[PDB]
Structure formats: C-alpha cells, structure tokens
Amino acid sequence: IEAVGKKLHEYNTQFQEKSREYDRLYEEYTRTSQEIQMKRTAIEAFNETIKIFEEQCQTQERYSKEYIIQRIMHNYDKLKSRISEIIDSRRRLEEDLKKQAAEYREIDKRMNSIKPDLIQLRKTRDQYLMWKLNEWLGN
Amino acid sequence: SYYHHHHHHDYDIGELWGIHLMPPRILVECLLPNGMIVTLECLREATLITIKHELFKEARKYPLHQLLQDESSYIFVSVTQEAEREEFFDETRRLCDLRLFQPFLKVIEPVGNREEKILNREIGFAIGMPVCEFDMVKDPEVQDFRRNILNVCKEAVDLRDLNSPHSRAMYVYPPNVESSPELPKHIYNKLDKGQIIVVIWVIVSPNNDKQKYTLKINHDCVPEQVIAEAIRKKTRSMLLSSEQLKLCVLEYQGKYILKVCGCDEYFLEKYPLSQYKYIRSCIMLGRMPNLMLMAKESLYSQLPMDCFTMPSKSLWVINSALRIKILCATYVNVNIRDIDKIYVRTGIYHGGEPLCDNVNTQRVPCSNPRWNEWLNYDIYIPDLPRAARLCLSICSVKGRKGWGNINLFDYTDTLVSGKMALNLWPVPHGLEDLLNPIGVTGSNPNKETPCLELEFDWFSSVVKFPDMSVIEEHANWSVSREAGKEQLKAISTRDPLSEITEQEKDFLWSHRHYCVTIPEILPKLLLSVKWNSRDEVAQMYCLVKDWPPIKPEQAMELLDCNYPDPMVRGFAVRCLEKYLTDDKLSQYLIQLVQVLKYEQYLDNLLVRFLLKKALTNQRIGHFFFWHLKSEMHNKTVSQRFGLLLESYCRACGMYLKHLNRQVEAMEKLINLTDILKQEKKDETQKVQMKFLVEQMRRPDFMDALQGFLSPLNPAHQLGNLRLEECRIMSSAKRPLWLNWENPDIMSELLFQNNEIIFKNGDDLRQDMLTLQIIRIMENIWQNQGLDLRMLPYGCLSIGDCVGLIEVVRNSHTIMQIQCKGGLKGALQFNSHTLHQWLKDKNKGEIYDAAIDLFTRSCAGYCVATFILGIGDRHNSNIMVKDDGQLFHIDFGHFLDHRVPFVLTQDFLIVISKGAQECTKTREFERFQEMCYKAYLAIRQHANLFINLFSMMLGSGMPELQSFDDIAYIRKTLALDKTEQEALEYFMKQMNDAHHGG
C-alpha cells in the first residue's frame, strides 16, 4: 500500500453501518405503508357502520311516533350513546393515521437522503480494487 | 407425491376488526326494522339460523314486536372488515366466519330478489375482494374487459358441454400425462420383459369386498385394452365358451374407466399406459400400479354444474416532433443539504430506449415544485411504435459533483392527449441507478402520494391505423438505390442476454429476408430494429405476419419485457396455441402468469389464451387460480389479476365451490398461525400446542379444515384431521405440520395418509421457482436417457409470504442421521451411520441399488446446485431417505451474490467405502462421468433457463431485478467458450472447492 493505505477498509465496515441501516430503514418503511392502508380501509368500515346506525333510530321515528306501557324507551337513549363511542373511535383512528403518515414521510425523508451518500461510497471501493491474491475482503 | 418418492429396491420383473379471535361469547347488537336495537349474547361458533331463531324468541319481549314479520322473511346484513355491506344469505355461516369488524347484525328483507345472483358474488371471497369494487371503476378499459372477456368464458363452457358427459369428466380430471409417447430407454430396461405388471381392482360392496386381478400387459397398451384384459380375467369361467366370453368383454367393456387407487386421477384418454405420469412413476419407483374399474355411471354421477350467466378519427399523419408538458408534482420528502436537487427525468421507451431522453430544467430543490415546461423529444410523431411509453422519475444525485410510466397509446389505438394526473410509485430497493422502465409501472395511477400533472399535445382526434396502411410499406423495400460467407446463423445458437454489437444489428436487419428460412433467429432480428423508424418497423410487422412457427420454448422469449409489441406477441401467443401442450403449459404456467404483467393492456391475446385453457383443463384452472390469488395483495397487479380472477371464477363451474373450501381453510390457518406468531404467544411449545389443539377442536375449525382438496395437488382429497398427528413444527416462524386421513375408497388401502406443512413467514416464491427449475433439469435428463433423480417436492405460495410445502416421509437431514447413533466427543460424521445408516435399511443386494440412487441424486443436485448457485449447503439442508436418495431442501437464496454443494467426506464414503481417501475409486469415476454429462446436458439447453428466469423479472423477488442477475447463470454455464472448453471450466470449479480434482 502506497498512497491512501488500508484506510479504505475501515471505510467498508462503516459502509455497512448504513448499507444495513438502509435495509432496516426500508422494511420499517415498507411495513408502515400497509399499516396505513389498513387504517384507511378501517375508516370506511367505520363510515358505513356509522352510516347504518342512523338508518335505525330514524326507522323508529314515524314507526314509533304512531302512538305518541309508554316506556318503549331506554333503547333510543342508548342507540345515541353508542354512536358517540363509534364517532370517537373513528376520531381516534383518524389522528393515529396522519401521525403514521407524518411518520411515513419521515421514514421516506431519511431514506431519500442516505441513498446517494450510500451510493457515493459504493464505487470508491470498486474503482480502487487493485490496491494467494484476495485477502482484504474477509475482515 | 404418489408414494413418497420411495423406491422398492429389487422388486424386479374466527375474527373481528382489531381482534384475532372473538371471545367464546360476545355481545352482538341486533338491529330490527322497528328501530329497536337488542343486544344478544352469542357463542362465537353459532350459525345465523341459531342466532336468528334466538332474536325472534327474544323479540316477544321487545315492544313494537307487533310490527315484526315471520322469522323466515328476513336476512342479516353487516359491515365486513373489507369495509363492505353484505347480505348474509348462507345462514349456515358461523358468526366467527363472517368477516365482521364490529359485533353487529342488522335485519332486513331479501331485497334484490335475485338471491341466486348475489350468492354467486361469493367469488369476491375466492378473489379476496368484493365483486363490486369493480362495479365502480371509472376507467372504461376495466369495464370493457369484464364485458368483452366473457366470449372466452362462453367459448370454454361450450367446449365442455359439446360431448355432454365425457367432455366435462375430461375438463375436470384431465389425463395426467408426460408429453412424449416415446419412453426413455433406461426406464424401458427396468421393464425389460418389454412390458409391465398391473393390478386392476373391482369393488363389490356393500359386501365391501375388493378383488384384485393381476395382468402382465404391454407398456403401451391403452386403457380400453386394459379394461378389456381385466374383464376377460374376472369373467373367464368353465361355463363360458371363449366365443361366449368375447361377447361379454364387450357388451360391457366401456361401461367402465380407470382410476389411480387412493387419489383422484382418471385415465380417460387413448394413450400408451406408460405415457401417464402415474405409470411411469410406478416403473422408476419399482411399484406395481393399482388401478380401479369405475362405473362411468358412478363417475358421471359425481359431476354437476353447466351454470353460466353474465349480468352486465385521424392517423399518425402528423407533422410535429413530440413534446410533453410537465407541470408540477405536489409532494416530495426532503429539505436541502448541499449538492441536492429535484427534476423530472423523462424518457420515451419501447422496452429499452428510443431517442435521447430528457431531464427537465432543475428548479426549486424543495419548496412547492413547479416546472411549467414543455419537453421536445427528438423523434417524429409518425415514427412512434405502438406501445411506446413515457418513462419518468424525480430522484436526484449530485448535479455539480461530490417514479412512473405511461402508455403513449390507449388500449383503443388512440394517441394520448391533454390533461393527465399521475400518482407515482415509491422507488424500489436496488434502484436509483435507473429511471426504471421494467416497471409494471406501465399504465399506473397508484394511490394518494407524489402526483405529477401532465399535458400532451393536441391536434383534432388521433388514433393508430389498420394493418391496411401498415402492410402498404411495400413502398420501402421497392426502393433500390444501387450506388454502393453468410456464416452468421451461428448466432441463432446464442443465449438471449448475449448482448449484440450495433455492427451485427445492421447485418441481421440487412439479410432480414433470409431468416424466414431460419425462423428461430427472429428474437435477435427483433432486437436489431431501430424501433424509432415507422419504416423498418412496418416492414417487420409484415415478416411477422407470415413468419414460420417456432418452438414454445423459444417462442416464450417474445413474452418478456424486451418484446412489448402487439404484433410480436400475437405470433408468440399463436406459437403457444400452435404447439405448447397442456403438459408443458403447466410446467411453465408460473412464467406465463408473470409475463402478463408487461402486457400493456388488460384485454389482449395472451390473457385470452391462458384464461381459455384454465377454463378447459381444470388441473390448469387450479394453479392459474392459485398463482394469481397468491399475488392479490400486491397493488401494482391486484386490479389486473382480480379482474382476471373474476372472469375465471364466474365460469370455472362447480370448481368454484371447491376453491372456496380451499380458501376458507387457508384463511383459518393464516389466522391461527398469526396468533402463535404474534399476540404474545411467544410462550412455550407445551402451552402453544395446548392452544393449537383446543382451537382445532372448535366446530368452526373442524368444519373449515376437513372436507377439502390439497392446493398442492387437488387429486389428493383431505378428509378428517388426524389431530393427534398435528404439531407446531415450531422451530421457526411457527409452521404447522398437518395430518389428514385420505378419504379415498381405497385410501390406506393401496397408498396413503395425507401430510403437509403450512408456513406463515417465509416468502415461498423463490423456493417455488427453484424447485420448478429442478424439475425442468430432471426432465432434460430423463429424456436424454441420462438418469439422475431429483426430488422437487410440492411448494405453493398462496398469498403474501404464506404457503404449503409437501412433506416427504422417511427422510432426514444429515444432522439427524448423525445424531441418530454415536457417543464420543468427536463427530465421526457417523461416516459409519451415514452409510451404515444406509447399510441398515438397505441390507442385501438392495444395498447396491441404494448406493446407486444416492450416487445419481447426489450428482444431480451437485450440478443443479452449482449451475443455479444457491443457498450454500450444510448438514441441515441436505436430506437422505431410507430408500437411498439424496435431496436438497430450503434453497432459500437463489442466484448467489460459488459452489454451494461441497461434497464432504461423508458423501464420498457412501460412494462405497474406500480407505485412504476415495478421490480415486471406480465408483467415483462412474460418478464424475454423470456430472459432466449432467452439466453438459443442461448446457445444451441453456437458452430455456435464461428465458424462464427472464420471464420471471416482473415479480418482487429481490433476487431477480435486471437481466444482469441472470448473468450469473450465464457465467456458470460457460460464457463464450466451447462445450469441451467449458467442461474444463466446471472441473476447475470442482477442484477449487474440493482440494482434489
């Protein structure tokens, strides 16, 4: 070794400290995407469900009103009280979602920032290749 | 598969959103038409007919009940977690089985009064997507496809009814046959009485009794001849004159047909007996075939169905150089450091690159990105080939120093013009190196992420042009401006990724007309065209029109990403229609499915080919369904495949019902294995198995997992679960070892108790491909007469990283063999009892045959494994059967990143015990010969494997992106070298790894 010595080897194990951090940052990235789409189809599920519970308390309108013992009662009191728990369930889902988006965009950011750096340290190894034969690779 | 590749030596001649598993008791909110919500406490395994009867028992408590109708006048409906509303007609259905989201049911009367029309939209279930998410796509291509495809469906259904009973029987139960009638001469000699002994059975129940009748008959003796000779035997009597006999073995010859005992095969087609795969396997394996006489009545009785319904200006004559307006992407992700930027790189593409493509002015490296540019690409408009594509991406590197694609033409032939919004795909995984045309990305709005807005040139109503105008490019070749050995059909014999010189492209194009004589050069010729000249291309279209046909092996190359042209592909498809047989079709069915990804438009020639066979040959239908369903989670292909699946399901017939059993069954498995893998069920084997068995005992499981067919081979019925024999193979992601009684009339009787691993974890796809390639090699070998014996066990991917693997009985890893027997501190490799292990099992003249098997198989793998550069083999990759045979499992990691199977001393000893080394024994000499013949044989058929791999580029598989990955296999098989040249190379690699040539 003459000019820049075996200093190009400490550059290689360090190279993996990000080459693998890519892989690990990527699966986190890939995972989180489905995670989101799960949440997103969940909300439509919520929607049509919410949508259904109105169609019910509005059935016992002109159908229950056609009399007004009288205590055909506590049913309606709670049919509202459940709707509350659903709208707030969906509400909770919603905020969990855009956080995961803000997360998704973050995971995207740091990946579209390593990539070029990871690639700029790729060929510095490959160019200076000529600098038993083969021994430097192992460790 | 039939036996367990076991030779007989010297025989001679329940859910809810968020929750995995609903409590054994939940409260379900029932909702009635009177407005009153009741809350019923249901057992999770209860039928809807039981919950309904309850609801209407509880109704008389709840006022306004005077408004409630007859029980048998209503239907339950709810929101499923696929976010849909579903009328629950099949009230047999268990609570836990109706995918459910929130624990509620809502009563209503059967609206849509076509009960039977909505039933059938089951299908979404088999598809894994509601058949109504289609009933809503704007894209007319889609709506057209669904409509225009049913021709094939109508065609197929006809081609089955035409011939009334037999035809169906033959649709279902296709004959399972090798595609050569000629029988290898190393098989013929295991025969060498010239012929074979079979045992044909007759059941005479309710006397239960089964009677054998052993015949020693011709190997090529068709099944009708076998039924005859069998009825001769049974009926021969001291009371029948031979004349009287002959008119009986007649007046009931053909009331019967043949059936493999124990599974569901049926020889129903005039073929040499030995051309059926069952018989040929019985030979190789040293087994006496057992077949059954089945009354046609009792076959033809089994088969119902026959049900099918279906409830639904100018030209290239333009004088301007193509421009495309790039507006604005609305989203990105990063915020500046130094030499970082953003710009929309654009290209015009036909497979790979016409025209010097264009990166548009780099402006604002972050803040809301406008470009408002026009992009002049340096080709004419009339020069654009049908299927030319806009390729774009955004990514940047280091400007100073240190993604989406679009069909330029509609499926309509119309040139694309005006406003377009293009949601972009997240960049792949081993990609920024490019701009990415390979991308399925062809025709591709996504969902809500980065979105480019576009503007295409506009000049009054534009389309492509009937082959009328096209053919009329005779004009060009009648241009003779004569002011200016042929030994080059060597380069037909040249692997597809050989990469050819511009100098050669010119040459081939020059002598283009002198290839309609050497037709197999077509691929190379097609590569030679400058595709950005409407002139060369239109001439091409015309050669192609009446080009001579080509072998499906070669004719497949024209279906990969490199040949994206309706005219090229049509010929290709017409080669496959011409002579690619149901046998070899299901060998290459994976690739043929994958290729569909680069097919530009939904409606097209290849799909219609495939769909039709799949609808004709139920054995193909099965894997066609499964290979497509497997990838429905992948949104780049979902819509295409979903749509393909719907047509298929709507026409396959009774089979649909079978497939759902299959699908319900796999749903249960995927949910169970999940619990164990996740839901903090990282407790202990003992606890887990507790759970495993409690769960499979519940009647929902019992029902789902018992009367179905093996997705690995539907001939194999799967009856009742052995249960005692079921275990979490734990020792991984938690794979399940499952055990089913084989409900066959001659079940244990005559051949098996059925076994299979379900694994929820690994991506099975690569394994799947490599097992496929092993089979293919094994086929090259057997035909060429050069007998080596691989064991490509079953392996089916059924969804995202989920699948079934075939169990092979009486087989062990070398490690197992090593632990079974021995004390000491050293290993000894049980070099003894891995040979002594083989001396036992195989005592006697059996031994020689077992050493042979080992030797064969060992050599087989040794090559296959080097060629494909797989895993890297140790003692828990390598498996031996009592039988003698060696075989590799868990290949895993594909095409390398050299010499994965290093022959340890253990294996050398097995090639009969030699003292100080066994590097030079005549047993080992014999062996080396085989390898050199094996490698040299696969060498001879290299282009095939290049293709197979190449056709397989459209698939996630991190192991296969680029053609340069297939390069490895190009190296390993010898790059430029001669046969006798490369033979040397292989040896150099044998010696380098072994330390002893």
Swiss-Prot record, chain A:
Isoform 2 is expressed in skeletal muscle and brain, and at lower levels in kidney and cardiac muscle. Isoform 2 and isoform 4 are present in skeletal muscle (at protein level). Polyubiquitinated in T-cells by CBLB; which does not promote proteasomal degradation but impairs association with CD28 and CD3Z upon T-cell activation. The modification Phosphotyrosine is found at residues 26, 128. It is linked to Agammaglobulinemia 7, autosomal recessive: A primary immunodeficiency characterized by profoundly low or absent serum antibodies and low or absent circulating B-cells due to an early block of B-cell development. Affected individuals develop severe infections in the first years of life. Belongs to the PI3K p85 subunit family. The SH3 domain mediates the binding to CBLB, and to HIV-1 Nef. Binds to activated (phosphorylated) protein-Tyr kinases, through its SH2 domain, and acts as an adapter, mediating the association of the p110 catalytic unit to the plasma membrane. Necessary for the insulin-stimulated increase in glucose uptake and glycogen synthesis in insulin-sensitive tissues. Plays an important role in signaling in response to FGFR1, FGFR2, FGFR3, FGFR4, KITLG/SCF, KIT, PDGFRA and PDGFRB. Likewise, plays a role in ITGB2 signaling. Heterodimer of a regulatory subunit PIK3R1 and a p110 catalytic subunit (PIK3CA, PIK3CB or PIK3CD). Interacts (via SH2 domains) with CCDC88A/GIV (tyrosine-phosphorylated form); the interaction enables recruitment of PIK3R1 to the EGFR receptor, enhancing PI3K activity and cell migration. Interacts (via SH2 domain) with CSF1R (tyrosine phosphorylated). Interacts with PIK3R2; the interaction is dissociated in an insulin-dependent manner. This is Phosphatidylinositol 3-kinase regulatory subunit alpha. It comes from Homo sapiens (Human). The lineage of its organism: Eukaryota, Metazoa, Chordata, Craniata, Vertebrata. The chain holds residues 442 to 600 of 724 of the full protein.
From Swiss-Prot, chain B:
Its EC number is 2.7.1.137, 2.7.1.153, 2.7.11.1. Changing residue 997 to D: Found in an endometrial carcinoma sample; uncertain significance. Pathway: Phospholipid metabolism; phosphatidylinositol phosphate biosynthesis. GO terms for molecular function: 1-phosphatidylinositol-3-kinase activity; 1-phosphatidylinositol-4,5-bisphosphate 3-kinase activity; 1-phosphatidylinositol-4-phosphate 3-kinase activity; ATP binding; insulin receptor substrate binding; protein kinase activator activity; protein serine kinase activity; protein serine/threonine kinase activity. Pfam families: PI3_PI4_kinase, PI3K_C2, PI3K_p85B, PI3K_rbd, PI3Ka. Residues 728-734 are annotated as: G-loop. The keyword Methyltransferase does not apply. Residues 722-997 form the PI3K/PI4K catalytic domain. Residues 318-466 form the C2 PI3K-type domain. Changing residue 499 to K: In CLOVE, KERSEB, CRC, BC, CLAPO, MADAC, CCM4 and HFMH; somatic mutation; also found in glioblastoma multiforme and endometrial carcinoma; somatic mutation; shows an increase in lipid kinase activity; oncogenic in vivo; occurs in the interface between the PI3K helical domain and the nSH2 (N-terminal SH2) region of the p85 regulatory subunit and may reduce the inhibitory effect of p85; requires interaction with RAS to induce cellular transformation; increased AKT and RPS6 phosphorylation in HFMH patient's cells. Keywords: Angiogenesis, ATP-binding, Disease variant, Kinase, Lipid metabolism, Nucleotide-binding, Phagocytosis, Proto-oncogene, Serine/threonine-protein kinase, Transferase. Changing residue 118 to N: In MCAP; increased phosphatidylinositol 3-kinase signaling; decreased interaction with p85 regulatory subunit; no effect on protein abundance. Residues 485-651 form the PIK helical domain. Changing residue 94 to Q: In MCAP; also found in a glioblastoma multiforme sample. Changing residue 331 to C: Found in a cancer sample; uncertain significance. Residues 193-295 form the PI3K-RBD domain. The record marks 733 as: Implicated in the recognition of ATP as well as PIP2. Also crucial for autophosphorylation of the p85alpha subunit. Changing residue 990 to I: In MCAP and CRC; also found in an endometrial carcinoma sample; shows an increase in lipid kinase activity. PROSITE patterns: C2_PI3K, PI3_4_KINASE_1, PI3_4_KINASE_2, PI3_4_KINASE_3, PI3K_ABD, PI3K_RBD, PIK_HELICAL. The avian sarcoma virus 16 genome encodes an oncogene derived from PIK3CA. The PI3K-ABD domain and the PI3K-RBD domain interact with the PI3K/PI4K kinase domain. The C2 PI3K-type domain may facilitate the recruitment to the plasma membrane. The inhibitory interactions with PIK3R1 are mediated by the PI3K-ABD domain and the C2 PI3K-type domain with the iSH2 (inter-SH2) region of PIK3R1, and the C2 PI3K-type domain, the PI3K helical domain, and the PI3K/PI4K kinase domain with the nSH2 (N-terminal SH2) region of PIK3R1. This is Phosphatidylinositol 4,5-bisphosphate 3-kinase catalytic subunit alpha isoform. It comes from Homo sapiens.
